[PDB]
Design a protein around this nucleic acid. Structure first.
Ligand code: K
Ligand code: K
Ligand code: K
Ligand code: K
Ligand code: K
Ligand code: K
Ligand code: K
Ligand code: K
Ligand code: MG
Ligand code: MG
Ligand code: MG
Ligand code: MG
Ligand code: MG
Ligand code: MG
Ligand code: MG
Ligand code: MG
Ligand code: MG
Ligand code: MG
Ligand code: MG
Ligand code: MG
Ligand code: MG
Ligand code: MG
Ligand code: MG
Ligand code: MG
Ligand code: MG
Ligand code: MG
Ligand code: MG
Ligand code: MG
Ligand code: MG
Ligand code: MG
Ligand code: MG
Ligand code: MG
Ligand code: MG
Ligand code: MG
Ligand code: MG
Ligand code: MG
Ligand code: MG
Ligand code: MG
Ligand code: MG
Ligand code: MG
Ligand code: MG
Ligand code: MG
Ligand code: MG
Ligand code: MG
Ligand code: MG
Ligand code: MG
Ligand code: MG
Ligand code: MG
Ligand code: MG
Ligand code: MG
Ligand code: MG
Ligand code: MG
Ligand code: MG
Ligand code: MG
Ligand code: MG
Lengths: 33, 224, 88, 160, 128, 87
RNA sequence: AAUAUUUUUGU
RNA sequence: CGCGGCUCUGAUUAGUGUUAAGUCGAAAUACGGUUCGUGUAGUGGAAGUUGCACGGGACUUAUCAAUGUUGAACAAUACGA
RNA sequence: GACUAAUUACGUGCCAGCAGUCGCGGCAAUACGUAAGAGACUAGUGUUAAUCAUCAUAAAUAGGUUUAAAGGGUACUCAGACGGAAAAAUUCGCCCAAAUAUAGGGGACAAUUUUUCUAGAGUUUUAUGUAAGAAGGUCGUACUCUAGAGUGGAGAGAUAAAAUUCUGUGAUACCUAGGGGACGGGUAAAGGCGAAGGCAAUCUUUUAUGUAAAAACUGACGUCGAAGGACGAAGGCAAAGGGAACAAAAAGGAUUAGAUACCCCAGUAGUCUUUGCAGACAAUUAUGAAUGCCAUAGGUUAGAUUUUUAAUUUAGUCUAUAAAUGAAAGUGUAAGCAUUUCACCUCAAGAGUAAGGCGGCAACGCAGGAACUGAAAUCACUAGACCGUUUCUGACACCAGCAAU
RNA sequence: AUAGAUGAGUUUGGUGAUGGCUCUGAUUGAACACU
């Protein structure tokens, strides 16, 4: 896999890792950890 | 694939087919090249086929998976061991120049080593001692050392006379009014002078050069 | 210790600067002048003999260029023989 | 086993691809069977078993091998003479069919079809120059020999 | 290391097929149907390759290593945890072969009782 | 390419020495006694197991090495690989 | 030889 | 009647796809102007950026201070660009 | 319009519309709408939907995974597939050979089994060599802390330049005497060692493989290996220690249009020790492990043999090639010719995401879709252009000088 | 059953690959539009 295409996966995994933090407390209230 | 498709061995097969028929259908084929019939009955030889090379020494029998089965082997004779023993005992025998340029290849036809060291066509050198030693060692059933001594002493008696001739031949020529040129001892010394002088020029030039480096280390530009 | 390796196949076996680069000699004399001023002084008498040498240097004519070195030509003859071969 | 015939098929190709005059093969009852078929078919020159070193080429046929007992059976080997003609090997391809993972058995009714350039089963038709070897009760024969003897068996390899 | 090669000499002297062929009553396996015993050539040296000697030598290495892994700081040696698993598995493949080859011969029972090799050493799967 | 070089460095050095017309004599320890080298008594390499030490002084070509000359490592290799396997 | 200011954008 | 499954719907709320013509920066591709990516842990409106180890899909992209030689005289009927 | 057999004119002007795919239409459109001509099928003709084939496009026949979708982090290993030599019994597998063939024949191969064999795989004979691993201890250069009311007496350190900062409560610099933690200079190499991860000061202790040479011994005991279990870098969580140095965070000073940043003054977790959890990596040779085999050369590592000078030779590793192979780059102890076996792939994007579930203290890991939207995504190479890219070549391009705006 | 195995348009500045999509062939217990 080229480096240009690897950066497409890099942006997807970061925005997801960044999303699971923001909604971590909300998922803890509903018992969805 | 840096190589190219060489079809040099099929120039006949290819030319024979291109000349069998005519491109213009309905006409007889024109005459073929002048060389098509000359090599009609002289096909090429088989190339690029690795055979089992000639074995100049008994191959290792204990090897169960031997390699290099298609590698030419070294040519070693019984004389190779004798040449090394002699020339090592007589290192300066190599300084005596020897010509390895053959004239017609028919040199081994007049060599009868049952007569002595002096043979026809070849000079008296360490080889004549080796060939004489190998003969006595094989025919007369002598040992390596026994044959070596006999063939080695005959070599000295012949070389001694050679050095005695140079001395007497010159001394004999002057007794009747015969003069010669510059001997090798004098010419050799004159050459050293021309070289020694050139070294002296190089020494004085570098010596003076180093003085500048010694003085340039310290600084005295102020001129106190 | 190991011996020199057999160079890989190169495009060209050559030396960048065949003929040595000559350094301006008068630049060395100037450095000596600047040394006196640093230690002795500017309007002094110790730099007299050194300042004169700097004027005589710039006045003298520069040497002539030396004949180019033919090293790169001989390196190109024995490249394929000395190295692994030529690459391109 | 069939693994030996597969190794023999690959090696004979690599040897012909390298344009080697002689070729060695492990001395086995199965390898000698196919070797005799290749020789009887005209692909290899001769077959003589010997030690780890090839016999004297000058007296290949006249070579008198020593008995094969348990004291030397581990060192014996089959020495095959490869053939090259018209700047081209005579045993170019030796593609196998029956591999250790699967043994392909063909019937007489199918070999009769494969012998005339028509597929049958997991095989394909034979074209000009091709050749198919079959291991049967009467030895490792050729598809045209097995068709004449009216027998089927195990397909070993296809030779071009 | 000195005991290692001194024990290897004990194993060859205790389980050596050249010593057990006479010290045991029925060392060899019982003959099969139609099979008759024949004389075989004598050995030119000590028997050091038989499964009995090897299984004993692996038992000497398993004890020296398993004892070093249970000593002080032995848990921290996480790289030799594989060395032990490879000695017990290597011994499992020789016991699994010698079992069917010896067909319950007396020479096979002398090795088990002497070394204490229970069925858990070769019969199942060794998971350490 | 044929890696060659001029051979006069040793070819003429032999012709110079032979121009002095002097033989080679056995070394003498310090009554000058210049004995020739090529003589049937001294210049001999073949021998038999009958000759004792009294004749070994004449020979010049020995098969064994000179102990005092060999290095400590070259001596070890001799003792182990040439002497030990001869008992 | 071991040096390093800043300098974005283009339907 | 209870438990479990399943379908629909749900204030509120999240992600992603598409849509030439908006705004804010300029992260990548050249040494991309702080080498870029992998993992992991933080951090920032956003792309990003920071620590730690790792990869080259980046430096094999490498090209002389060994400065390069009186290596056996000369003359002859030998030798003759 | 081309695929697809068959042309012009006028009108329309990215509007109206056409379209199965690529596409056409922006004022002289063979592609739209009319008129004419032309090409074809015909009581049928087109369109929509569907199925097969196209598609080797889930490849049993018959694929593929270095750089294009796709090799598991690792190999010990249960099951399971596959696997020598020369004979024999049994099955009658396989073949004659079927019709799901009674009963026979043939014996190469196949399955179970038996007896022998040594070429595979193993054992012994302290190899040599070696940063695999572990325990208990130490050594040293530098750093840092304390003290000597030391010497000396105004600056130091930082950066491209500075500022925050240090210093008259005596700093930096130069010493003396006590400590205190972690680090590993040279040697050092294309070198080596382990299953991988990874392992480089030193002593003792301790542990499994591997390699060379000969002999001896066992006698196919072998390879691969789902799952389980074990091991698994840095970072991280948990507990107790340690804390010199470095340094996420937090915080300040500059740079800048702005600057969270790159740079700087300082600095907590953390890095280290011990006991557990955790299991993700460009865990890489972007190349699973293993067997058989194919022509040379130049280095290099640990051995062996020898006429130990220098050449043979075994097992590794690294460059450059031949045949060959490949999309090519290139490989050429393999990315070749073959084989075994496991894992994995089936257009892009959504997505390694959602839901339920499992593991974990947590962080997260394992497993793993579909809807919506597309006709392309994607690889290597070729020639250019560009480079706050290298080395050069021309030009008042620049420097310098004079004149001018 | 021995004649039975076939391609085309489309990614790129361009070449060669990879990999889809679409057309070409046959058909329906078919529907619709114009007849
Ligand atoms: K590169
Ligand atoms: K049978
Ligand atoms: K002080
Ligand atoms: K190794
Ligand atoms: K710091
Ligand atoms: K664990
Ligand atoms: K090599
Ligand atoms: K989703
Ligand atoms: Mg990929
Ligand atoms: Mg530790
Ligand atoms: Mg633009
Ligand atoms: Mg709602
Ligand atoms: Mg960046
Ligand atoms: Mg940028
Ligand atoms: Mg950058
Ligand atoms: Mg990074
Ligand atoms: Mg911050
Ligand atoms: Mg780059
Ligand atoms: Mg047309
Ligand atoms: Mg297009
Ligand atoms: Mg129209
Ligand atoms: Mg009709
Ligand atoms: Mg891998
Ligand atoms: Mg895993
Ligand atoms: Mg992975
Ligand atoms: Mg039967
Ligand atoms: Mg036996
Ligand atoms: Mg034996
Ligand atoms: Mg063996
Ligand atoms: Mg040792
Ligand atoms: Mg003071
Ligand atoms: Mg310390
Ligand atoms: Mg590594
Ligand atoms: Mg070091
Ligand atoms: Mg295995
Ligand atoms: Mg597993
Ligand atoms: Mg950790
Ligand atoms: Mg930790
Ligand atoms: Mg803590
Ligand atoms: Mg700040
Ligand atoms: Mg650690
Ligand atoms: Mg790693
Ligand atoms: Mg595997
Ligand atoms: Mg290495
Ligand atoms: Mg290479
Ligand atoms: Mg291939
Ligand atoms: Mg996908
Ligand atoms: Mg997953
Ligand atoms: Mg989930
Ligand atoms: Mg280019
Ligand atoms: Mg101008
Ligand atoms: Mg100006
Ligand atoms: Mg004006
Ligand atoms: Mg392009
Ligand atoms: Mg394709």
């Amino acid at each position: 896999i080229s480096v240009r295409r690897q950066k497409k996966l890099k942006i997807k995994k970061k925005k997801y890792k960044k999303l699971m933090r923001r909604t971590r407390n909300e998922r803890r209230k509903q018992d969805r950890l | 694939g840096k190589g190219r498709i060489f079809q040099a061995a099929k120039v006949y097969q290819r030319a024979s087919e291109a000349a069998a028929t005519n491109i213009v259908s309905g006409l007889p084929p024109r005459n073929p090249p002048l060389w098509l019939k000359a090599i009609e009955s002289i096909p090429p030889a088989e190339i690029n086929t690795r055979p089992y090379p000639i074995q100049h020494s008994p191959p290792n029998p204990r090897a169960r998976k031997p390699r290099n089965l298609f590698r030419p082997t070294k040519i070693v004779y019984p004389e190779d061991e004798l040449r090394r023993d002699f020339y090592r005992d007589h290192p300066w025998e190599l300084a005596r120049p020897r010509m390895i340029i053959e004239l017609d290849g028919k040199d081994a036809r007049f060599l009868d080593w049952s007569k002595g060291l002096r043979q026809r066509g070849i000079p008296l050198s360490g080889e004549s001692v080796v060939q004489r030693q190998l003969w006595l060692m094989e025919n007369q059933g002598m040992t390596k050392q026994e044959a070596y001594d006999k063939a080695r002493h005959e070599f000295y008696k012949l070389r001694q006379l050679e050095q005695m001739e140079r001395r007497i031949a010159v001394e004999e020529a002057r007794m009747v009014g015969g003069y010669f040129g510059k001997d090798l001892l004098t010419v050799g010394m004159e050459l050293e002078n021309k070289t020694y002088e050139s070294w002296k020029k190089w020494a004085t030039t570098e010596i003076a050069r180093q003085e500048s480096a010694r003085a340039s280390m310290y600084t005295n530009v102020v001129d106190n | 210790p190991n011996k020199p390796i057999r160079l890989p196949p190169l495009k060209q076996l050559r030396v960048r600067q065949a003929n040595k680069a000559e350094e301006n000699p008068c630049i060395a004399v100037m450095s000596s002048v600047l040394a006196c001023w640093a230690s002795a002084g500017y309007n002094s008498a110790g730099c007299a003999t050194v300042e004169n040498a700097l004027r005589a240097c710039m006045d003298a004519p520069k040497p002539a260029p030396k004949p180019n070195n033919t090293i790169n030509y001989h390196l190109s003859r024995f490249q394929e023989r000395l190295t692994q071969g030529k690459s391109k | 086993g069939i693994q030996q015939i597969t190794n023999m098929c690959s090696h004979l190709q690599n040897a012909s691809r390298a344009r080697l005059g002689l070729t060695s093969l492990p001395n086995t009852k199965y390898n000698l069977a196919l070797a005799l078929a290749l020789h009887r078919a005209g692909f290899i020159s001769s077959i003589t078993r010997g030690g780890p070193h090839p016999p004297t080429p000058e007296a290949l046929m006249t070579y008198e091998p020593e008995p094969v007992t348990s004291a030397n059976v581990a060192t014996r080997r089959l020495w095959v003479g490869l053939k090259y003609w018209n700047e081209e090997p005579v045993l170019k391809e030796l593609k196998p069919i029956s591999k250790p993972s699967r043994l392909v058995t063909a019937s007489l009714e199918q070999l009769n079809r494969v012998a005339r350039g028509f597929p049958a089963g997991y095989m394909k038709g034979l074209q000009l120059g091709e050749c198919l070897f079959v291991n049967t009760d009467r030895g490792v024969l050729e598809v045209r020999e097995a068709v004449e003897r009216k027998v089927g068996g195990l397909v070993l390899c296809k030779v071009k | 290391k000195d005991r290692k090669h001194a024990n290897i000499r004990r194993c060859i002297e205790t389980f050596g097929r050249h010593i057990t062929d006479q010290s045991l009553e029925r060392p060899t396996p019982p003959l099969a149907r139609g099979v008759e015993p024949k004389p075989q050539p004598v050995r030119a040296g000590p028997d050091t390759g038989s499964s009995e000697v090897q299984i004993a030598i692996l038992t000497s290495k398993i004890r020296a290593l398993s004892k070093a892994l249970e000593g002080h700081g032995g848990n921290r040696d996480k790289n030799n945890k594989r060395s032990l698993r490879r000695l017990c598995h290597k011994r499992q493949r020789l016991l699994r072969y010698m079992e069917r080859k010896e067909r319950g011969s007396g020479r096979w029972h002398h090795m088990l009782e002497t070394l204490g090799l229970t069925p858990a050493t070769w019969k199942g799967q060794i998971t350490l | 390419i044929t890696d060659f070089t001029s051979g006069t460095q040793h070819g003429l050095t032999l012709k110079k020495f032979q121009a002095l017309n002097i033989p080679i004599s056995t070394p003498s320890e310090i009554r000058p006694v210049q004995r020739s080298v090529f003589e049937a008594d001294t210049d001999v390499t073949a021998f038999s197991p009958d000759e004792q030490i009294q004749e070994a002084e004449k020979r010049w070509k020995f098969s064994g090495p000179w102990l005092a000359g060999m290095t400590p490592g070259e001596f070890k290799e001799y003792l182990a690989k040439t002497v030990r396997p001869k008992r």
